[PDB]
Design a protein around this ligand. Structure first.
Ligand SMILES: NC(=O)c1ccc[n+]([C@@H]2O[C@H](COP(=O)([O-])OP(=O)(O)OC[C@H]3O[C@@H](n4cnc5c(N)ncnc54)[C@H](O)[C@@H]3O)[C@@H](O)[C@H]2O)c1
Ligand SMILES: NC(=O)c1ccc[n+]([C@@H]2O[C@H](COP(=O)([O-])OP(=O)(O)OC[C@H]3O[C@@H](n4cnc5c(N)ncnc54)[C@H](O)[C@@H]3O)[C@@H](O)[C@H]2O)c1
Ligand SMILES: O=c1ccn([C@@H]2O[C@H](COP(=O)(O)OP(=O)(O)O[C@H]3O[C@H](CO)[C@@H](O)[C@H](O)[C@H]3O)[C@@H](O)[C@H]2O)c(=O)[nH]1
Ligand SMILES: O=c1ccn([C@@H]2O[C@H](COP(=O)(O)OP(=O)(O)O[C@H]3O[C@H](CO)[C@@H](O)[C@H](O)[C@H]3O)[C@@H](O)[C@H]2O)c(=O)[nH]1
Lengths: 299, 299
């Protein structure tokens, strides 16, 4: 059957569209922004306005990536985060039940874990530290509640991504801003002392995990971390970018932002056992891919 | 300091207002519906429209009970459930940070557990089966995220209530409808075969738990079940009501409603250790209190 991707114009979504089409799948793309062997049908619209059942005609698999994804604006833009991240999810899942979609792969987030040292496992109680994390937890729990309805023949794979980077990374993210601070001298502010850590996951690995998750169809629903299990500090990413480029990143240290967790590290075990997924790209290699893409993109 | 109760016109809220005032506390009541030794100041308004910081002047303790509380309408009224249960909570917690409120006691729900046999413990992963349960989980996680902000001197006691009944019970609830089916012959539909079970908790016990929770001020935040640990089936409640009244309840069996969990039973241990709270009222005694109140109320 055909596949529908919400959020298809965005960072992860555009990579997923490419891989789906290269694999021979016909793709229906939904986004309110323009898109950058399988066919491609672009539907331009807001999930809260489109006739979603019409969009889901002959769709057997949905990848739900649309959302407002920034941690820090969520404190002061909460109506819009609720509308885009929770209400739109609820509408999409109802339409999936009505249209007889078989499987929905939902982008969730490591943000549901909140603050924790060391490994974040899918059996840990969620305790988001930001309103954004609350909305991603609500979206993933909504998806699971729809899959548990007695009238639905619907499974859900909810994927908790860990800070994704690479070619095309959204420009509000740290590595994208740092690379512009390096190649173009546009200063980046460091939010705190730079000792915060992230499990940075390359988008190519995330797209492989998304495809694997969609192919697990007879095992019910699942909640899985998608990450590398290796955390790197902000300061270390700055030093690596300086080393790779021979240009001094234009940085300025400022105050930590409330809502930012101090460290993330994925427990990678359950995705390996359920999907056969292990991340292949480490940060040193992946960072070079983003730097090279950004050069060519600016030229 | 003075205490503010949101949802003060409702079932649990009105009982809490009474006990707060009888205890000598000055109460500020907020609700968009009229209210049925401590003074009482009634503020009439919607939490999404009022100047909440103004309402919180000289308030040291907030009891957040306002919400749309029905499980079953939440599938088809989801915008309003998000607005009342999640957006209003976020606005209230921000105003609590800005106003320097010390402690917020939040009404959460056993609905966050979803479907589970046997005892529901606060260490179990939440898995709500209805959009209502998703909104209560979001409200309680929001409250905890605000309490964890570095700029807040704020603690949260989040109370997961188990199906509350007694004098004044909301008329959409089962025991209220059954009593009208008995005393007044207004038929009640049974949603399924009546073998579903609930941990029914008397409102007097819930109000005692609310007061105890507010008095724990130097131990940070807590998430606690408030229930009896004894589950009773719908059919057994029907037979008890018939026995107590000598009138045949006017019932009609119909189809189970999607979103209704099959059974609830509270793990009562953590509230006993943290609050010294143990429920005192069992269903046979409590059911008689509601029947007697309802007689006098109808006359
Ligand atoms: N990038 C990461 O590090 C990361 C980490 C964890 C989780 N996630 C999650 O992965 C998903 C994709 O993230 P991304 O970095 O690609 O974000 P992105 O902002 O690049 O892509 C999201 C897309 O969704 C669209 N969109 C938003 N609301 C919409 C609406 N109401 N209707 C139609 N389209 C709408 C946007 O136009 C955008 O193109 C998001 O759900 C996000 O929460 C991302
Ligand atoms: N009754 C139960 O069995 C039970 C069980 C678990 C949890 N809870 C929770 O306990 C709390 C109280 O439940 P209840 O049975 O007393 O419900 P209720 O409906 O009787 O009381 C809720 C009150 O909140 C008010 N309200 C709703 N939205 C408002 C808004 N935007 N602004 C101002 N006021 C608003 C309503 O007018 C109403 O009086 C709710 O948070 C509910 O989710 C109740
Ligand atoms: O200009 C900036 C931007 C970010 N940071 C810091 O860099 C780290 C990473 O920030 P960023 O790349 O913006 O990603 P996160 O805020 O960690 O969020 C990403 O990863 C989260 C967890 O996976 C997802 O929930 C989010 O949607 C996704 O944006 C954090 O410690 C920030 O405090 C700075 O110092 N300066
Ligand atoms: O007309 C009716 C109403 C209810 N029921 C059944 O009676 C049980 C109890 O229903 P009700 O008294 O409406 O309470 P719940 O739906 O269990 O919800 C209450 O208890 C939940 C868990 O504590 C809270 O989350 C909710 O806010 C609160 O309304 C359920 O099995 C219903 O299916 C019927 O058979 N007929």
């Amino acid at each position: 059957g055909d596949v529908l991707v919400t959020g298809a114009a965005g960072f992860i979504g555009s990579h997923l569209v490419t891989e789906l089409r290269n694999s021979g799948r016909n793709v229906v793309a939904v986004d309110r922004r323009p898109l950058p062997t399988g066919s491609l049908r672009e539907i331009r619209g807001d999930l809260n306005s489109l006739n979603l059942v019409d969009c889901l005609k002959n769709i057997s698999t949905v990848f739900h990536l649309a959302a407002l994804p920034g941690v820090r604006p969520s404190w002061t833009q909460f109506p819009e985060y609720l509308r885009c991240n929770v209400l739109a999810t609820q509408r999409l899942m109802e339409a999936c039940v009505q249209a007889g979609v078989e499987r929905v792969v939902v982008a969730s987030s490591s943000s549901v874990y909140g603050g924790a040292d060391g490994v974040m496992s899918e059996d840990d109680l969620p305790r988001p530290l930001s309103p954004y994390g609350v909305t991603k937890l609500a979206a993933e729990r909504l998806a699971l509640a729809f899959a548990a309805r007695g009238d639905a023949e619907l499974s859900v794979g909810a994927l908790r991504f860990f800070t994704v980077y690479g070619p095309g990374q959204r420009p509000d993210m740290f590595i994208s801003r740092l690379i512009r601070a390096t190649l173009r001298g546009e200063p980046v502010e460091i939010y705190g002392d730079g000792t915060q850590l992230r499990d940075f996951t390359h988008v190519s690995d995330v797209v492989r995990a998304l495809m694997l998750t969609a192919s697990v169809r007879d095992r019910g629903s699942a909640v899985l971390n998608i990450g590398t299990g290796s955390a790197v500090s902000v300061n270390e990413v700055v030093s690596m970018t300086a080393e790779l480029t021979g240009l001094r990143p234009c940085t300025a240290y400022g105050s930590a932002r409330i809502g930012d967790v101090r460290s993330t590290t994925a427990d990678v075990r359950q995705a390996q056992s359920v999907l056969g997924f292990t991340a292949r790209t480490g940060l040193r290699e992946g960072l070079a891919t983003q730097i090279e893409w950004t050069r060519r993109s600016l030229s």
